[PDB]
Amino acid sequence: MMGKLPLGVVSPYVKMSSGGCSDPLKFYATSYCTAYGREEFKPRLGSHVGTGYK
Amino acid sequence: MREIVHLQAGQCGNQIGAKFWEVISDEHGIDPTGTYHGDSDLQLERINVYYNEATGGKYVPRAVLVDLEPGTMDSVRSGPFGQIFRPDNFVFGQSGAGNNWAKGHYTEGAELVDSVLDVVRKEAESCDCLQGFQLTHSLGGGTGSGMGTLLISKIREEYPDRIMNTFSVVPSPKVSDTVVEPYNATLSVHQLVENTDETYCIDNEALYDICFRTLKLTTPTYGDLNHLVSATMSGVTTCLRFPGQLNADLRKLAVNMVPFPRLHFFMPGFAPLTSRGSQQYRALTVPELTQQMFDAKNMMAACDPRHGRYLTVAAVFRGRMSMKEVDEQMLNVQNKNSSYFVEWIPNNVKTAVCDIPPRGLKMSATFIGNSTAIQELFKRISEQFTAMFRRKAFLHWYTGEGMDEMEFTEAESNMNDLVSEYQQYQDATA
Amino acid sequence: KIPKDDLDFRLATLYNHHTGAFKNKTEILLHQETIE
Amino acid sequence: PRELAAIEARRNREKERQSRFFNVRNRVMGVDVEALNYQVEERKFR
Amino acid sequence: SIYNLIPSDLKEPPQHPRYTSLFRATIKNDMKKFKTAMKTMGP
Amino acid sequence: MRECISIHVGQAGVQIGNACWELYCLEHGIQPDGQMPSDDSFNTFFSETGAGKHVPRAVFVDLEPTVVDEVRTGTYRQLFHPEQLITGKEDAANNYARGHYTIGKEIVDLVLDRIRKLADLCTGLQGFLIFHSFGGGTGSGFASLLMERLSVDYGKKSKLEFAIYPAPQVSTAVVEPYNSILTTHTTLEHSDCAFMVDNEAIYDICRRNLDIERPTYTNLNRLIGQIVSSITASLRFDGALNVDLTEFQTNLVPYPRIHFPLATYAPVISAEKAYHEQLSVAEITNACFEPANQMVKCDPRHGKYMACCMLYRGDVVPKDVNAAIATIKTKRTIQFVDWCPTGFKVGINYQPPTVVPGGDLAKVQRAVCMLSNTTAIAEAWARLDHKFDLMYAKRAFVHWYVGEGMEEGEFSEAREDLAALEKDYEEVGVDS
């Protein structure tokens, strides 16, 4: 957190911060979140490699 | 990232900024102890602009409390958010100025400058990429108007490129609370005119006016006045901390407001100052917001822009709105009142939005305007200083400190240079 | 002097590995056309 | 595999293409009334 | 040569005034279409 | 295979990509994670990975974190390469000068790699799509310098330009004419096409047609997404007359100094208004010529068309297109230059425009886009020249730009370049 960080770098808080509430009725709702917000979607961490002998 | 060190000088500076650190603690969800108890995740995303991290999950404001007297610092510590400041930032001496600009600037503050520079440079180094500093003081005192400028003049030499804001408090004509007021005021504004990027002119008699007019408070104490000033200071850097559809910073507001380097004096205002009779009969909608924005009664200076020409106008909005109405209503004020805006600058208004409104409120805005009506302040100080400087009145106090008499001549000649140069820009042909 | 490749793009930067120490990406890739 | 899958995709796509195109009424003038109704209701809710 | 060693006169033209758009007079006419004096703030 | 890399610059550039890249993801079936739940129509924008997952060919740049910082947190945080989105420490702050000489030069080098690394991943590059804004500093300054280097690095590739022109009446900046006049040199000798579009016209169209009385920028970005989608719809999916980027460059540009078309999209109607109106090929192509639907605040009836590019999409047939072309030609309100007897280049595509949930347009079985190179645009710059001239005379705001480290003589020269360009467009309007 207290580091100097390189030039194109994600800040330590926003490396993991969750966005504001997607519902317009709740406070701290951003314009981006109200424009594109989907609570019922947890992104799968898709990753796969390998296949040498084949 | 983008950090600000909040300076502080004098009783006015300490009492104003004591409220200021509270209102931004509430905005960031920080308890009087100093820990994070907020609920939204954006409440701690850009907290490093002001706060400094401490061990145990605590936060220390990046403030430097300076005053020649240890007096108000006891009251500062005895406040509700008293112990949020780390004690090593409190810098103070033995004997104050006693509303004497000379003692603060030359004979007493010159001992206190070196220590403050040590704390300031310590805070300056800690942040990676500091945007600038920010000083709150009054021009009718001895320390904030005195050594408070000597901090300005030294630091500018050390850091030229960084922005320096000054939420100064200028004396008022109708009722004054210091008799050597124009002596310190006419000689402090010379320091501002050479070493300052922006100054906001806040006058108390306007602040006393607004509380009765737009809020109808029977007993507005200096706390309600100080909260009114501190809402402006939050409103200029809200776009710095919180994301917006169309963002702005201090420097973005800096470039568009000074057409020439001599002009950095403005008059601010706060939009949703709504009275306790008028909330029942009201419709919170953006034309009503800009209606109260541009009404001259809402200014917090002792000058009437209806007497002069608006050079450039800033409108920093808070809350989620629709920008078509933001662009239209700005255009309506632009054209319906043609003669109050200069002709050689088309589109004299700059707009910016910040998505998150102030806590507990839905819609808001703040206004920064550079007007030629501010020259009515300088001439008034000039005459009140000259009439006091004709007869060598109250002067033995200052020249006994070792100052010659000649700085008063150049401080008033520079000051009367500004009013003549301001006047020529008012009466200019397209 | 057209790079035509990422490898030849990074192969023309002004960053002596021996002397330059503890730099970030932008300090690694520095070009004379940029310093013009 | 995907090479022949592309052929079959072009096949059923051209068949449905001729079904939609050859009806002159729907070709010169065509709306999905249920989709328009759905988005009207969604707009009203918002 | 002996004639190129002689210094030679140099005359260069300062060109000519820049092009002015055909709609410029229309723009100057339109500059006061809706602007009004002290209609909302007041005198 | 045809591929395009997008080089979104500035807050306007970043926000537009939010509308564009969500549109392309929903068009092809991309889930927000980037993975298909279900031939290679996506190769023009996406690229395959070692995990069987698609990554766009985009590079988001800004000189301040918080615009792009949100993108790293929202629903598409897992869709874009964490290094693909480059930010900065300090911004130009509405200043072409700082973004061209002081702050930008620290980050010209970094982006020029990711442009190259995205370039080598492609085999046959078709073009570069550049989104920026003429008003702000970063979208003008750093945008300008990156074309100067992109010109000498990629001398043959096609660099397209979508940009926000400063509006004649409203704006968000006071210092905005100085950037606008001085940016024009870069989009004159270092670009191949340009699509200056203005916010008031989109403001006018959205209120009049889409019933939205109170729009915001998202309501503006979505229409900009539809226009770029129409241009690349020929490349991504098959067509009766597929028109590549090289084809429509050919039949729009009579002279290299003239690469400023005007964009138009139709139909744009709400479902209630789409309920009581049939939409034929003739109907929409008549709306493409209405000056109330042009996306630039200029009237083509005050000028004459030199070249008009067509782009139909959806359930359209060449028989009706030739019928609609003939009727338009028989209209004395529409003028054409003498040396262009035939000024049409028609493109047909199968796949109808896809609609976005939470959007505004109705789902329509057919549409049309318009790229008409007209000489009525030359009035737009003439307005800018006057406002710049009445500002520059008293020398306002010059202390900011010169003290940065740029010479004051470049100001006068930049004003001359637009002055020379305006004369060239009016000469084309002269008829023998």
Ligand SMILES: Nc1nc2c(ncn2[C@@H]2O[C@H](COP(=O)(O)OP(=O)(O)OP(=O)(O)O)[C@@H](O)[C@H]2O)c(=O)[nH]1
């Ligand atoms: N049409 C449209 N214009 C936008 C949008 N966002 C910003 N702009 C335009 O951008 C201009 C100012 O530049 P910005 O994009 O806000 O920021 P910037 O380009 O990075 O320049 P700086 O603010 O100096 O950093 C304004 O004149 C707006 O018209 C948008 O979402 N849609």
Ligand SMILES: Nc1nc2c(ncn2[C@@H]2O[C@H](COP(=O)(O)OP(=O)(O)O)[C@@H](O)[C@H]2O)c(=O)[nH]1
């Ligand atoms: N707005 C505001 N002004 C104050 C406050 N306290 C003092 N002042 C102003 O400060 C001036 C006197 O300041 P002073 O104590 O002499 O400042 P110092 O000499 O720098 O310590 C008076 O004119 C007051 O108007 C406050 O709480 N709010």
Ligand SMILES: [Mg+2]
């Ligand atoms: Mg910007």
